[PDB]
Structures are given as structure tokens and as C-alpha cells.
Amino acid sequence: VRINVLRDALKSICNAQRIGKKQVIVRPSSKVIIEFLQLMQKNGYISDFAVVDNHRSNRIVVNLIGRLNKAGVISPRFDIPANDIEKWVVNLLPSRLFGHIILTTSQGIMDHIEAQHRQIGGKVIGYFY
Amino acid sequence: KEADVKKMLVATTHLGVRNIDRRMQFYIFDRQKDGTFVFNLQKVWAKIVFAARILVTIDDPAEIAVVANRPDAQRAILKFCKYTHATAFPGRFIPGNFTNRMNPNYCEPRLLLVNDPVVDRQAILEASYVNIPTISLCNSDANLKFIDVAIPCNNKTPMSIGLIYWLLAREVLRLKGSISRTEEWDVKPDLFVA
Amino acid sequence: DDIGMKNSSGVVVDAYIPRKCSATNRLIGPKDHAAVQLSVARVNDKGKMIENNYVTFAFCGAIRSRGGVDSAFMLLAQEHGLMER
Amino acid sequence: PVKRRNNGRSKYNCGHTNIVRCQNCHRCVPKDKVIKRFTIRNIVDNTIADDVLNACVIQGFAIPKLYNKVQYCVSCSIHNHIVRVRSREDRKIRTPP
Amino acid sequence: GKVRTKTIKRAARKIVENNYESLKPKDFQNNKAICSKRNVAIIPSKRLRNKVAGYVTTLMNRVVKGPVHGISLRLQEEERERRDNYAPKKSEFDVENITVSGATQQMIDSIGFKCMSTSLK
Amino acid sequence: HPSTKLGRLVKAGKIESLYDIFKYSLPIKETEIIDYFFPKSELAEEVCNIMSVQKQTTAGQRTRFRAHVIVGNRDGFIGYGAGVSKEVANAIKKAAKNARLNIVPVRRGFWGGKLGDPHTVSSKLSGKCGSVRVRLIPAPRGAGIVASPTVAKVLEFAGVSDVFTRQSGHSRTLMNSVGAVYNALKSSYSILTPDLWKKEQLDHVQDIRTMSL
Amino acid sequence: MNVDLLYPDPVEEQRKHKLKRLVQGPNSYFLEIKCAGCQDIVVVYSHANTPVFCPGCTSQISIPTGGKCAFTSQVERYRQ
RNA sequence: GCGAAGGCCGGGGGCUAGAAGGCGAUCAGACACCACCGUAUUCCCGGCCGUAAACGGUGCCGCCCCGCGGCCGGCGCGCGCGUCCCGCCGGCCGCCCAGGGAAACCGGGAGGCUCCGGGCUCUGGGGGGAGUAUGGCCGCAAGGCUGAAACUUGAAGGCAUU
RNA sequence: AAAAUGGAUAA
């Protein structure tokens, strides 16, 4: 059984960007995997994305400007205390200055900076750098 | 040019070997009754004219050196080296010609031109160590490693190697405007044959 | 484009900045050997002459080893336009 | 260390092979670890090449030829020199010599 | 059993390419004079002079008939040059090829000029 | 003479500043060139472990000595190269020569606050050589260099004075521990960040091999 | 050739497996047969793995096959 | 639930090999190896037993991952029309691009990890003592499964190079 | 065809 849609899909993005693979393919698509990609495209780590709505699992198209290093998901999706979002940042972030950890908060899918600006905490979904 | 296309079809340059790779499928054209591959000559011109274009970039054409270990060829390289201003590095490659500060044949070329990677692999390998962009001219089976560009060509007959070397040199000099400028070439197609 | 790390003042403070591969955007390495800033030459055509000034393409060291440096080139100069489709 | 990837046998996808015995040792080695080189030879030694045919009354009779596979054990073979101890580089090459 | 030492072989090669005309195919003594002729070459000791002389007489035989590589002669480079720079009296190779290969026709069709379409065919 | 095409260009001054040569990734094989390009305190050096190396042959055992030398300047430059020779001192000289050729540019970094001039490392740069796996983690201003006594001093010559390290493997090996860190320190420039993602440059006529004095 | 997955050449999708297509769907289609009294369309399953019978007749129009079903009488291509 | 081989229980069998046993040579002594003879066994039907270098010494599903291949089972499209050519899937395999690892080397993973987090399960923690003792439990037994401690010792051990 | 052995301790 495909236990996690996001992990395989994020490994596949990263796999394409080591082989260059300007055009990348994600086969199983979930709303969260779209929300992760808009967050990435808005950041600019990935250039853009789309999904071909075949009337089954909706396959996803990924376009990467090629400037990508490691993009992995953190599951088990531990909820993080708002005060200690940084301890997870120390382990998963290259430099406190750059990088992003996408969390899920009630207000909506939000990145590490937005969470501490609102002083809020959420379940870790993944790290994109 | 229809008379050069007739010459290219005469050279049998449009012939290929058994199989191609992901990169080579671009130059592939068709399958014969026996099964070796064939190449579209449009791909031959773009690659050879591109090679002419890229070859004028480095001042001191000895720096755009030529290396080959193919019996049918070497002579064509030895004719190109004469018609252009390049230096041939043929026969035994002397592995470590490019490296070794005290090498009898110290070589530091700025660009490289080969007869093909498979015939002498040391040549293409010796690009990575010495920071050198490398070019070769290959048949349908193409191990395209380290090579900026590669040109589909038979590389099976002295005549085929000769006519692509003639077409390259004619274009290299014509693209420069040094001679010909698309006029009858100063040397014949048969001059480069072994 | 203000490329490079900066202080609170905003001047580039990371000393040397490595160039980027044209096809993968990976930074050409400090001791990477295969990656090269080779130059491609345009022609007047009516002039039929080199104009002395022309574009350069950096082929990343990794792509050279991977073997895709050739198919990358046709695309690199296709967007530039000098090479045909 | 694994001297060879085949691990010394050609057993692939089965997990079992039928077992035979060395012509010499009579050691039982599964079909996969067996030399098995096919033999075809004239029944009288080629030294009696045509001496027999000149002696043979019947016209156009050809000397009978044996067509027997010889199955030897690995241990028996190296000591009878049917195959030698190859070098690390030499082991991968096949091409029956 | 006799095989020559490297010192003799190396010098002998120099003496055969320094002067092929002066050296002799069978006369060891003519070569012996050239081997020990002060400015031409010096061999310390007669036996070493004799050693080079025997080889330079055999090497003279080698150069005379089908010379092995590593030896240079004035005539050899010039004589080779004439054959390499000889182009066919008239290059009859191009002519009209005729006999079209089976699918080669499409490649000419797909580049804008037909190579005498159905004339070589 | 100057043996290399780059070596003559360096003495001539056609290509100047070590940082420019590193930018074009030109292999440097001339020892004399580094001393000419940088005369500032020459290079600070350390002789890390001259190990004893042996080959048992017939009657007795041959004993070469293998030495690893750290040569560096606190301008984001660290040099780690080694040499082995029968003479113990000669090995050190051969190592210093190697240490000159493989001097590697270190990016250097600014932490959460860019208060002044770079003393921190760039990202959590990580390199492994042998079995020793080491990650250089950026550290706060007051944090200095935390690592093995020998590994930390390699960092001081590199010029990072704000780093955190956790090397894992057979660390007792001076040969690969201080070697794995060298891979990490060089990796500093191989890594990339969003400002570095901006596409510019491609000056073309600036190729070191193209330049002729 | 800078084709990307978003628009794959039709032949590529037609060559690949009907599940491994950027748009997955039916490999099979409806192919006509000809019967007594009919010059018009007599559509049938292209890959019938079961017997179809001559309209108003006892004999079976399509032979059973794991793949596309074969026929013993005159037949008409796809849809017309 | 099934599970090689050997064992064992009750019937049968009984050719050949052949645990034991005798025997010759064999050597200092061989009661070992090599001959010769031979019971159990091998064979069969109903039972137990529950082990193996049960091996790919690589758990189980899941997904991406580079070219050259061989075989194999369906399954297609064009060619002249062949048991062709390109392949599409499920396997069987050889070489191996990345990449990994102490390396041998895996690379259809032993890759996508210190830039560590798809899920479920077992199992280990220096080397002996020790699969030992005992407490069970299962078995006709032989034994299997679970499973100690006291005590000792500085190396044991992997792949490599000379 | 027949061949077993070599104290400890440093070198």
C-alpha cells in the first residue's frame, strides 16, 4: 500500500533535480502535495506546477528551475510546541538564516517564519531547501 | 548544399552501427533491412557547422588540438591540422600527455577534437582532469561522456571520415571567412583519405 | 541582481562568487575540473566572419560525467537560437 | 569474501538441481557445480586413422564416433587440469577456449 | 647466445639515422670507422666500437629492406611525403553514386534538396 | 621558469588574486604560484601526525613515514595535503607542497544576526573521508570552534571562528579526521543559497585559459 | 525535442501501458463486422473474450481470443 | 498449516549404494584415508520429529531510480509478410551510469541518510562461559523452542595491501 | 604411494 503520498512524491522531485530532469513527474496527488508545491513555488525553490485531472488519482506536473537541494517529509507528523519550533529547526535547517519547515496550523498551511511571527505551533509536514 | 549532400550520401556518412542511446536518438533517422541505423544529414550539417562555429572561439588553434587513434583516420586529422592551425596528437595517446608538468609531450589544449570516444577512451577521459571542453564525431552507438558536442558520422570507411573532415574544415575556414566563404574548397574531398 | 551573501549593510561579503551551470544552475565547483566556461561563436553570415565577441556556455562537471552535456547543448543554444530546433 | 557472484554454481530461480557424480572421484556435486564438457572422438585412436578403413571390407564405412558428455566434479577437475585456477581479472571472462 | 646491451642498441640507432649513406650493409669495418670517427661518433674501447659496428651493419640491412620504426633518414621523410601528398590522378570517387540505399531517400527529402530524386534511384 | 600556462599568467599578472583562479576552477599544480599570489604571513602551517608506514618484504620491513600538513590563512582558505618519504622531514616538505595545491576556498557565513564581518560557517557543511563523518554546524557569536583539538585548529587556520562539530567514526585517525573536515571546508563553495541562485556573469572573455599575457 | 510531460507526443501515450500514460484510459475500442443482410455498421467489442452471435443467426461472429477478438467473415474498421 | 536430509513408530518390501560391524593392505600406530564384505538405512504406505551453509549468510509490502544486453510468458503496431523489427507489461539473469560503503563490492539495491523521519515485523550490543544450568512446554525417543547467572579475558572479529 | 613434530622469553 502507498502509505504516504507526500514522501515518495518529494523523493521523486529531489531525484529528478540530481539528474537535472527539468520536467519532473508526480503520479499520486493529494491536496497537501499541491499546498506544499504552492508554498515552494511562492518561495521560488521550484518555478511552477500543474495537475492533469485524469478522472482517477490526478497525476501532478512539477517544474523545477533546477535550484533545489533536499526536499523531504517529516512523518511521523509530530505536532511541535510553539516555543520550541527552533529545536526542530536546528536539526532540519541548513543555517538559521535560510530554509523552510512547512507546518500545519489552523489558520492554514504555514512556513517556519510565519509560525514564529504568529507565535503558533503545528504538525511538521516537511523541510524544503 | 545539394552537391555536398550528394557527397555526404557518397561518403556513406549516413550509415550507423547497431544501436543508439537517449542522446543519439536525436540524430537517428531510420532502420535498414539488415538492421544497422541511418542518420538524417540535416543533423550532420547542424553539428558540423556548430562545430565550425565553436572552433573559432580559442585564439592559437594549436590550443584547439586534435587527437585520434583510428587507423582509417589520423590522416584526415593530419590534413585538418595542416589546413587549420591545429596540432595533431595521434598514435599511442601517451596517457598523461595532458597532465605531468615534465611530460616530453606536455599538452595543455584549450579545446579538444577527437575522431570518437570509444576508439581511444583515454582522450575524452583526459578532458575531465585538465579542465578542457571536448568534442568527438560518433556513429550510432555513442558513449557521449565529457563531450560538449558529437557529430553523427559513419567512421567506418577512410572516405567517410575524409568527407566529414573535408566538410568540417571547409566550413571551419569558410565560417571564419579565411577562404571559400561557401565557394569551391581550396582542397578536394579526397585529400583527407588515409 | 545583488548576488551573494551580505551583512546587515547589504554589501556582498562572501568574497568570491562561483558561476552557475547553464543547464542545472549548480555552482561550478572551486576545485571542480570537468565543468568549463567554453565559448560558442555567432557568425555575421552575410559577413561570414567571426565578430570577436560571442556567448559562452558553462557545462556542469556532473552533466559531463552523466553524458547529457551534448543533448544539453542543443537545447542551450536552441533558447539562445544560434543552434536550430 | 565472495570469490564469484555465481557463488560457484549456476543455480538460478530453482533452489535445487538434480545431482550427478564425478566420472573420477564419484563425489556427488549438483548439476550446477559440474564441469560437463561434451566429448566426440573416433572410437579407434586417430593413430589407426585409415589403417582400419583400408582393412574394412564394407565400402564407405566411417569409423564410429563416441558422443558422450563427461561430467567431472570441481575437485577432480582442477587436479586433472580440466580447468585451472584463474586470476581475479581472468575469472569474469567466459568465451569457451 | 648474443643479444645487444641497451647502450649499444641506443647509440647504434643514432649512428644509422645520423648517416645511412656513409654506413655499409655488410662491411663491418666501414661502419667501424664511422662509429669511432671523433666528431661523427666516439666509442670508448674497440670492443664497444665493434659491438655498435656489428649492429649498425645489421641495422643497415634493416634500414635497406623494410626499415623498423625509430630510425630517421633524409630520403625516408621526403620519399614518404610524395606518396601522402599524391591525390588520385583525378578523383573519380564522386561520379554519380546510383543504387540508392533503402531509406536514405527520406533523409535528403527532409532537408530541402533532393539528390537527383529517382535519377540515382 | 613558470611550468604551467596558469603559472606564467600568475607571474605575469594576466590572471590575478587566488580567488579569481578558484572562481574559474583552474587546476593549480605549481607550488611557487601560491607563494607569489599570497605573501601575507606566507601560509600558517601545522604538521598533523607523521605516522609510521611499513611494507614487510623478504628479510626486513621497509619504513616510510607518512605526514599530513595543515597550511592556511584566515581569509577563508584551508590547505590539507599529505606526503610520505623515507626521510621523516622530507615527508613533511612533500606534504607542505601538496597542502599548497589543495588549498580550498571556504565560503564563510553570517548567522542569525549579520552583526559585523563573517566569522561563522556558511551552512551545516558536511563531508566524510574514510569512515570519519563530520558536519560543521554554524554557531552563535560567543560560540568559538568546538571540535577535536587537532580538528578545531584546522578550522582556526580556515578562518571560521564560530563553528559546532560532531565527527563520528574512527576519529582517532588524524589522517582521515582532519581530512574529512577538509572536504567539508571545501564543500562550502559547492553548496548554493537563493541570492547565489541569481543568473548573471557569463563574461566569456574572462576565461583564464583564454587570457594570453 | 524539448517536449515535457505536460504535452506528450500522441504516439508516446499510444505506445506506453494504458495505466502508465499521463492520461490513462481504454486501449480497446469498437470494431464492426459484416453479416448477411448488412452493408451497414455491425459494431462489436474489439477484444471480445466471449461469443457474439450472427444477428438472428446460430453461428458466432467473433472467435474468442485473450487479445482483440478475431472473426471468420467480412469486417469493418473501428467506427464508420 | 507446510517444511530437504537423517532419525523414529507400525505395516510392508529389498535391487543398488551403504551409518555400525568385520576384513585386507597402510604406516611408529592407525581400529583413519584406499580396496573387499555387509546390518540399519535407501524404497513404499499411514504416523511422529521440526532441523540445515533452510543462503542472495541480504525480512515483508510501497515507490522513484542509466544504459547495453541474454532468456522467458503472454500482448500489441507498422514492415513484406519473417517464428521479422519496435517494443508494452510479469519474471529469470549478466555488465554496470550515478550513488553508497572499512573494503570485497550492491547498483531490478547493499542507491535515493549525519543534507538522517512511507509503514509493519524480528534480531543484536567486546570476546569466552553459553545455547550452558535451571524452570517450564512440546516430543515415543533422539532432541527442539524459550533461556540464565556466577566466573574469566584483551583482544575476539570484517574486508583489503605487502 | 608413504611423512609426525618443534619448548618461553625478547630480539
Author numbering:
A (entry chain SJ): 2 to 130
B (entry chain SA): 16 to 209
C (entry chain SY): 4 to 88
D (entry chain Sd): 2 to 98
E (entry chain SU): 2 to 122
F (entry chain SB): 28 to 240
G (entry chain Se): 44 to 123
Paper text:
Giardia intestinalis is a protozoan parasite that causes diarrhea in humans. The highly compact and uniquely GC-rich Giardia ribosomes possess eukaryotic rRNAs and ribosomal proteins, but retain some bacterial features. Using single-particle cryo-electron microscopy, we have determined high-resolution structures of six naturally populated translocation intermediates, from ribosomes isolated directly from actively growing Giardia cells. The translocation intermediates, with naturally bound tRNAs and eukaryotic elongation factor 2 (eEF2), display characteristic ribosomal intersubunit rotation and small subunit’s head swiveling—universal for translocation.
